[PDB]
Amino acid sequence: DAAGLAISDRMTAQIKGLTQAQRNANDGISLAQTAEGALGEISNNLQRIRELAVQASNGTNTQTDRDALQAEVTQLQSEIQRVAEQTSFNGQKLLDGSFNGVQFQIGANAGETIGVSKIMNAQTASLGGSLTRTTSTIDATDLTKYDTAMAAGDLTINGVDVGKIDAASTAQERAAQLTEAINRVSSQTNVGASYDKTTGQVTLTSNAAIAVAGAANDATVAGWANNATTGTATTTTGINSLTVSSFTNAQQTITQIDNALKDINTARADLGAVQNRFTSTVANLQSMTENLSSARGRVTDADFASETANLSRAQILQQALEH
């Protein structure tokens, strides 16, 4: 019975181990579905941003029109960021870049595992990857000569005149005025302005050096003094520094959002594959466990039959002998 004890004990280890492992694989499906659903909501939000970037590139837009589109973009970036930073399955974050992958015990024995691969950092500071362009930032508060009116020719961008600008009563108003006039010619100069009202900063953006010229040559009235190579080549990650404030900005946003969607798509593809792997694992474990338990059932049935038959036999023989 040495072999019988060894087999019975292994059958028990197998049945119980493979039964827990099917639970484990089912839990793996649920985590992946969760991560994939959440990425799906981010993708929706990304499409919305992209669509607003197309709309913002309308040649008939005022700055006020673009600022309204940017308000919605800002709302969307907030929602993408909280989904990416908050999403979890049973106490473990999935989309913040901290999911280094996990292995699932899907067999009875140590080391019989299936890995869920690391999941991308879908936070807005990371989503979509690299983006390098030329930027130049001022503060609205720098515009101390906001009262000094501008006549056409005072400020030019890449040799394109921004035109006349009336006297302002605040530095912040001149900031608004400069954003507006620069952005009017953005599609022609390849330079766009984003005026962040939360901070008061005006950022110029381009794919190349910015040629600032004109009659005024005073940063305190027209934001930037004359300089043929204005701006610095600068890199950020993700979509968080994206705006649709100008044609130039909105064109960058389209391109970068496309990069972000690609990243999401491939992450969702990975997660679909791992679900598939877990589902075929569950099918395998269910089949194996059913076979093993059926085999056990035949053994215990036979044991009961032999016990009953042996006990009966001993009594019937006893009777025969007592005659």
Short mmCIF file of C-alpha atoms in Angstrom, two decimals:
data_model
loop_
_atom_site.label_atom_id
_atom_site.label_comp_id
_atom_site.label_asym_id
_atom_site.label_seq_id
_atom_site.Cartn_x
_atom_site.Cartn_y
_atom_site.Cartn_z
CA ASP A 1 0.00 0.00 0.00
CA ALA A 2 3.12 2.23 0.02
CA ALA A 3 2.35 3.15 -3.59
CA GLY A 4 -1.36 3.55 -2.73
CA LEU A 5 -0.62 6.06 0.03
CA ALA A 6 1.76 7.99 -2.22
CA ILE A 7 -0.82 8.18 -5.03
CA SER A 8 -3.79 9.04 -2.76
CA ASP A 9 -1.80 11.90 -1.22
CA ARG A 10 -0.70 13.22 -4.63
CA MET A 11 -4.28 13.01 -5.91
CA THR A 12 -5.36 15.10 -2.94
CA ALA A 13 -2.57 17.66 -3.51
CA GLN A 14 -3.48 17.85 -7.22
CA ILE A 15 -7.26 18.14 -6.82
CA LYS A 16 -6.95 20.86 -4.16
CA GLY A 17 -4.05 22.68 -5.85
CA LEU A 18 -5.73 22.75 -9.28
CA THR A 19 -9.00 23.89 -7.71
CA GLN A 20 -7.28 26.89 -6.04
CA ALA A 21 -5.38 27.55 -9.29
CA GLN A 22 -8.63 27.87 -11.25
CA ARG A 23 -9.71 30.48 -8.72
CA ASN A 24 -6.30 32.18 -9.23
CA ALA A 25 -6.72 32.21 -13.04
CA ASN A 26 -10.28 33.57 -12.76
CA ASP A 27 -8.92 36.35 -10.51
CA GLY A 28 -6.32 37.11 -13.21
CA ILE A 29 -9.10 37.51 -15.81
CA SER A 30 -10.89 39.98 -13.53
CA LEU A 31 -7.80 42.14 -12.94
CA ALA A 32 -7.02 42.26 -16.69
CA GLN A 33 -10.66 43.10 -17.58
CA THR A 34 -10.55 45.84 -14.95
CA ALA A 35 -7.30 47.32 -16.28
CA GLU A 36 -8.59 47.04 -19.86
CA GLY A 37 -11.95 48.71 -19.12
CA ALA A 38 -10.18 51.62 -17.42
CA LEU A 39 -7.79 52.06 -20.34
CA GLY A 40 -10.94 52.06 -22.52
CA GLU A 41 -12.34 55.06 -20.65
CA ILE A 42 -9.00 56.89 -21.05
CA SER A 43 -9.07 56.12 -24.77
CA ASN A 44 -12.57 57.64 -25.07
CA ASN A 45 -11.35 60.78 -23.31
CA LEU A 46 -8.29 60.90 -25.57
CA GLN A 47 -10.53 60.77 -28.68
CA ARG A 48 -12.54 63.71 -27.28
CA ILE A 49 -9.34 65.74 -26.77
CA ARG A 50 -8.20 64.81 -30.31
CA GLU A 51 -11.53 65.88 -31.78
CA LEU A 52 -11.34 69.23 -29.96
CA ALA A 53 -7.81 69.67 -31.35
CA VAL A 54 -9.22 69.35 -34.90
CA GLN A 55 -11.98 71.87 -34.06
CA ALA A 56 -9.41 74.28 -32.55
CA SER A 57 -7.48 74.22 -35.79
CA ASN A 58 -10.50 75.95 -37.43
CA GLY A 59 -9.23 79.04 -39.27
CA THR A 60 -12.30 81.07 -38.23
CA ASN A 61 -11.81 80.64 -34.45
CA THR A 62 -11.40 83.54 -32.04
CA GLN A 63 -9.11 83.07 -29.04
CA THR A 64 -12.31 82.90 -26.98
CA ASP A 65 -13.48 79.95 -29.11
CA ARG A 66 -10.14 78.18 -28.60
CA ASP A 67 -10.15 78.97 -24.86
CA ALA A 68 -13.54 77.26 -24.54
CA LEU A 69 -12.21 74.14 -26.28
CA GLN A 70 -9.17 74.24 -23.95
CA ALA A 71 -11.48 74.38 -20.91
CA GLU A 72 -12.96 71.06 -22.01
CA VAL A 73 -9.51 69.63 -22.81
CA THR A 74 -8.47 70.60 -19.27
CA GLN A 75 -11.52 68.78 -17.84
CA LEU A 76 -10.60 65.67 -19.88
CA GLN A 77 -6.92 65.64 -18.79
CA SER A 78 -8.11 65.77 -15.16
CA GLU A 79 -10.35 62.74 -15.73
CA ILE A 80 -7.62 60.76 -17.52
CA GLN A 81 -5.19 61.54 -14.67
CA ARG A 82 -7.53 60.37 -11.90
CA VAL A 83 -8.46 57.16 -13.75
CA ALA A 84 -4.74 56.49 -14.26
CA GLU A 85 -3.75 57.35 -10.68
CA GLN A 86 -6.72 55.77 -8.84
CA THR A 87 -7.55 52.59 -10.84
CA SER A 88 -6.93 49.46 -8.82
CA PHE A 89 -7.96 45.86 -8.46
CA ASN A 90 -8.12 44.60 -4.88
CA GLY A 91 -5.71 47.18 -3.40
CA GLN A 92 -3.15 47.19 -6.24
CA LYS A 93 -2.85 50.16 -8.65
CA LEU A 94 -2.88 49.13 -12.31
CA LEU A 95 -2.30 52.23 -14.47
CA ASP A 96 0.10 54.54 -12.61
CA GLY A 97 3.29 52.84 -13.80
CA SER A 98 3.72 50.99 -10.49
CA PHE A 99 2.38 47.68 -11.83
CA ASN A 100 5.68 45.94 -12.53
CA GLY A 101 3.77 42.82 -13.53
CA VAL A 102 2.65 39.92 -11.34
CA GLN A 103 2.83 36.14 -11.61
CA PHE A 104 -0.21 33.94 -10.95
CA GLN A 105 0.09 30.43 -9.54
CA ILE A 106 -1.95 28.47 -12.11
CA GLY A 107 -0.77 24.92 -11.34
CA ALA A 108 -0.62 22.69 -8.27
CA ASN A 109 3.15 22.99 -7.90
CA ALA A 110 5.62 25.74 -7.03
CA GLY A 111 6.75 27.68 -10.11
CA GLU A 112 3.78 26.79 -12.32
CA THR A 113 2.88 30.38 -13.09
CA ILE A 114 1.58 32.77 -15.76
CA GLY A 115 2.75 36.39 -15.73
CA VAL A 116 0.67 39.50 -16.29
CA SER A 117 3.15 41.88 -17.92
CA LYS A 118 3.94 45.36 -16.62
CA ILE A 119 1.31 47.95 -17.47
CA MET A 120 2.19 51.38 -18.86
CA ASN A 121 2.04 54.60 -16.84
CA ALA A 122 -1.21 56.12 -18.18
CA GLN A 123 -0.82 59.27 -16.03
CA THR A 124 -0.93 62.49 -18.09
CA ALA A 125 2.73 63.27 -17.25
CA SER A 126 3.67 60.08 -19.11
CA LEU A 127 0.91 59.00 -21.54
CA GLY A 128 1.97 59.23 -25.21
CA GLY A 129 5.70 59.47 -24.53
CA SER A 130 8.22 62.01 -25.75
CA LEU A 131 7.52 65.45 -27.23
CA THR A 132 10.26 67.90 -28.08
CA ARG A 133 9.66 71.40 -29.42
CA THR A 134 10.83 75.02 -29.04
CA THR A 135 9.16 76.98 -26.22
CA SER A 136 9.44 80.48 -24.77
CA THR A 137 7.58 81.45 -21.58
CA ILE A 138 6.84 84.86 -20.07
CA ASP A 139 4.59 86.00 -17.22
CA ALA A 140 1.63 88.34 -17.78
CA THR A 141 3.09 90.37 -14.85
CA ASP A 142 6.15 91.17 -17.03
CA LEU A 143 3.95 93.40 -19.19
CA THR A 144 4.48 96.57 -17.14
CA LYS A 145 4.08 98.82 -20.19
CA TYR A 146 0.60 97.43 -21.02
CA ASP A 147 -0.67 101.02 -21.44
CA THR A 148 1.67 101.59 -24.42
CA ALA A 149 -0.50 100.95 -27.46
CA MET A 150 0.87 98.93 -30.39
CA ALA A 151 0.60 99.91 -34.04
CA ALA A 152 1.08 97.34 -36.82
CA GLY A 153 4.81 96.72 -37.26
CA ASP A 154 5.65 96.87 -33.54
CA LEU A 155 5.79 93.08 -33.16
CA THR A 156 6.54 90.55 -35.90
CA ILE A 157 6.79 86.75 -35.59
CA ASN A 158 8.87 84.96 -38.22
CA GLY A 159 8.47 88.15 -40.28
CA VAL A 160 4.68 88.19 -39.95
CA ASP A 161 3.14 91.28 -38.35
CA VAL A 162 0.74 90.68 -35.46
CA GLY A 163 -0.93 94.03 -36.22
CA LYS A 164 -2.28 96.85 -34.06
CA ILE A 165 -3.06 96.31 -30.38
CA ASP A 166 -5.07 98.94 -28.41
CA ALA A 167 -3.98 100.32 -25.02
CA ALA A 168 -4.60 97.89 -22.12
CA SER A 169 -5.67 98.75 -18.56
CA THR A 170 -3.95 95.73 -17.00
CA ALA A 171 -0.86 93.63 -17.70
CA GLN A 172 -3.20 90.58 -17.80
CA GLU A 173 -5.29 92.23 -20.52
CA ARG A 174 -2.18 92.85 -22.68
CA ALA A 175 -1.28 89.19 -22.13
CA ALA A 176 -4.73 88.35 -23.54
CA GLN A 177 -4.22 90.77 -26.43
CA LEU A 178 -0.80 89.37 -27.31
CA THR A 179 -2.04 85.76 -27.20
CA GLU A 180 -4.90 86.74 -29.53
CA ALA A 181 -2.76 88.58 -32.12
CA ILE A 182 0.02 86.01 -32.18
CA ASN A 183 -2.53 83.21 -32.58
CA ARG A 184 -4.29 84.98 -35.45
CA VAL A 185 -1.09 84.40 -37.49
CA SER A 186 -0.15 81.02 -35.94
CA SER A 187 -1.02 78.96 -39.04
CA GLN A 188 1.33 81.20 -41.07
CA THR A 189 4.22 81.61 -38.60
CA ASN A 190 4.16 78.08 -37.12
CA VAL A 191 4.32 79.70 -33.67
CA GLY A 192 1.43 79.44 -31.21
CA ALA A 193 0.64 81.03 -27.85
CA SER A 194 -1.02 79.43 -24.81
CA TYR A 195 -2.05 81.81 -22.03
CA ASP A 196 -2.50 79.85 -18.82
CA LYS A 197 -4.92 81.89 -16.71
CA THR A 198 -4.45 79.67 -13.64
CA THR A 199 -0.80 80.86 -13.43
CA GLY A 200 -0.66 83.92 -15.72
CA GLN A 201 2.04 82.41 -17.95
CA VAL A 202 2.14 82.88 -21.71
CA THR A 203 4.04 80.15 -23.55
CA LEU A 204 5.10 80.39 -27.19
CA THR A 205 5.58 77.09 -28.95
CA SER A 206 7.08 76.15 -32.30
CA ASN A 207 8.95 73.32 -34.05
CA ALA A 208 11.88 75.72 -34.58
CA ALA A 209 13.55 78.93 -33.40
CA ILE A 210 11.28 81.98 -33.12
CA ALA A 211 12.27 85.15 -34.97
CA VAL A 212 10.99 88.13 -32.97
CA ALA A 213 11.33 91.54 -34.63
CA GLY A 214 9.46 94.81 -35.15
CA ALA A 215 9.44 98.47 -34.11
CA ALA A 216 8.56 98.16 -30.38
CA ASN A 217 11.58 96.05 -29.31
CA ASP A 218 10.42 96.11 -25.68
CA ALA A 219 9.33 92.96 -23.79
CA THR A 220 7.49 95.16 -21.28
CA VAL A 221 4.98 96.25 -23.97
CA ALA A 222 4.91 93.35 -26.49
CA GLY A 223 6.02 90.38 -24.35
CA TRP A 224 9.17 89.58 -26.32
CA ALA A 225 11.98 91.96 -27.38
CA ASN A 226 13.66 91.56 -30.79
CA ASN A 227 15.62 88.32 -31.08
CA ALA A 228 16.02 86.12 -34.17
CA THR A 229 16.55 82.91 -32.16
CA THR A 230 13.92 83.18 -29.42
CA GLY A 231 13.08 79.97 -27.57
CA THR A 232 14.67 76.81 -26.21
CA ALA A 233 14.44 73.24 -27.47
CA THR A 234 12.54 71.54 -24.64
CA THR A 235 11.22 68.07 -23.91
CA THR A 236 8.28 66.92 -21.85
CA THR A 237 6.58 63.56 -21.51
CA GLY A 238 2.86 62.83 -21.79
CA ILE A 239 -0.11 64.98 -22.75
CA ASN A 240 -0.26 67.29 -19.72
CA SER A 241 1.60 70.19 -21.37
CA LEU A 242 -0.63 70.00 -24.45
CA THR A 243 -3.15 72.74 -25.25
CA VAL A 244 -5.47 73.66 -28.10
CA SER A 245 -4.94 77.41 -27.45
CA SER A 246 -3.58 78.08 -30.94
CA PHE A 247 -3.35 76.37 -34.30
CA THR A 248 0.28 75.40 -33.63
CA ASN A 249 -0.61 74.00 -30.19
CA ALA A 250 -3.66 72.12 -31.49
CA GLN A 251 -1.61 70.51 -34.29
CA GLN A 252 0.90 69.22 -31.73
CA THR A 253 -2.00 67.91 -29.63
CA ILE A 254 -3.45 65.88 -32.54
CA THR A 255 -0.06 64.24 -33.18
CA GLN A 256 0.78 63.58 -29.50
CA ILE A 257 -2.76 62.25 -28.73
CA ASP A 258 -2.30 59.83 -31.63
CA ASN A 259 0.88 58.66 -29.86
CA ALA A 260 -1.11 58.30 -26.63
CA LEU A 261 -3.90 56.32 -28.30
CA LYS A 262 -1.27 53.97 -29.80
CA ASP A 263 0.21 53.38 -26.34
CA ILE A 264 -3.29 52.67 -24.90
CA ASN A 265 -4.17 50.38 -27.85
CA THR A 266 -1.04 48.23 -27.40
CA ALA A 267 -1.56 48.04 -23.62
CA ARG A 268 -5.16 46.94 -24.24
CA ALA A 269 -3.90 44.41 -26.78
CA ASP A 270 -1.45 42.92 -24.24
CA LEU A 271 -4.20 42.67 -21.63
CA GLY A 272 -6.57 40.99 -24.09
CA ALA A 273 -3.89 38.37 -24.79
CA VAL A 274 -3.31 37.67 -21.06
CA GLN A 275 -7.08 37.26 -20.56
CA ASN A 276 -7.06 34.73 -23.38
CA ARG A 277 -4.19 32.87 -21.73
CA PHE A 278 -6.01 32.74 -18.37
CA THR A 279 -9.24 31.62 -20.06
CA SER A 280 -7.51 28.71 -21.83
CA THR A 281 -5.79 27.97 -18.50
CA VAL A 282 -9.17 27.83 -16.69
CA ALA A 283 -10.50 25.49 -19.42
CA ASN A 284 -7.43 23.27 -18.95
CA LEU A 285 -7.72 23.24 -15.14
CA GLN A 286 -11.48 22.57 -15.17
CA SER A 287 -10.96 19.58 -17.49
CA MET A 288 -8.00 18.21 -15.46
CA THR A 289 -9.75 18.61 -12.09
CA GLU A 290 -12.92 16.91 -13.43
CA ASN A 291 -10.84 13.96 -14.65
CA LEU A 292 -8.95 13.70 -11.33
CA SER A 293 -12.11 13.93 -9.21
CA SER A 294 -13.82 11.32 -11.44
CA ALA A 295 -10.80 9.06 -10.93
CA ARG A 296 -10.98 9.62 -7.15
CA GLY A 297 -14.72 8.82 -7.24
CA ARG A 298 -14.06 5.43 -8.87
CA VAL A 299 -11.44 4.62 -6.21
CA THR A 300 -13.65 5.51 -3.22
CA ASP A 301 -16.64 3.73 -4.78
CA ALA A 302 -14.47 0.62 -5.16
CA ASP A 303 -13.29 0.98 -1.54
CA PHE A 304 -16.86 1.14 -0.22
CA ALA A 305 -17.82 -1.83 -2.41
CA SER A 306 -14.88 -3.89 -1.12
CA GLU A 307 -15.50 -2.97 2.53
CA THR A 308 -19.19 -3.89 2.24
CA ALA A 309 -18.40 -7.10 0.32
CA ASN A 310 -15.69 -8.20 2.78
CA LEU A 311 -17.80 -7.50 5.89
CA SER A 312 -20.76 -9.34 4.35
CA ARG A 313 -18.59 -12.28 3.26
CA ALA A 314 -17.17 -12.79 6.77
CA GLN A 315 -20.67 -13.00 8.28
CA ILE A 316 -22.15 -15.31 5.61
CA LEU A 317 -19.14 -17.65 5.89
CA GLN A 318 -19.53 -17.60 9.70
CA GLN A 319 -23.16 -18.80 9.25
CA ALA A 320 -22.13 -21.58 6.81
CA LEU A 321 -19.50 -22.80 9.30
CA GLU A 322 -21.90 -22.66 12.28
CA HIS A 323 -24.12 -25.25 10.55
#
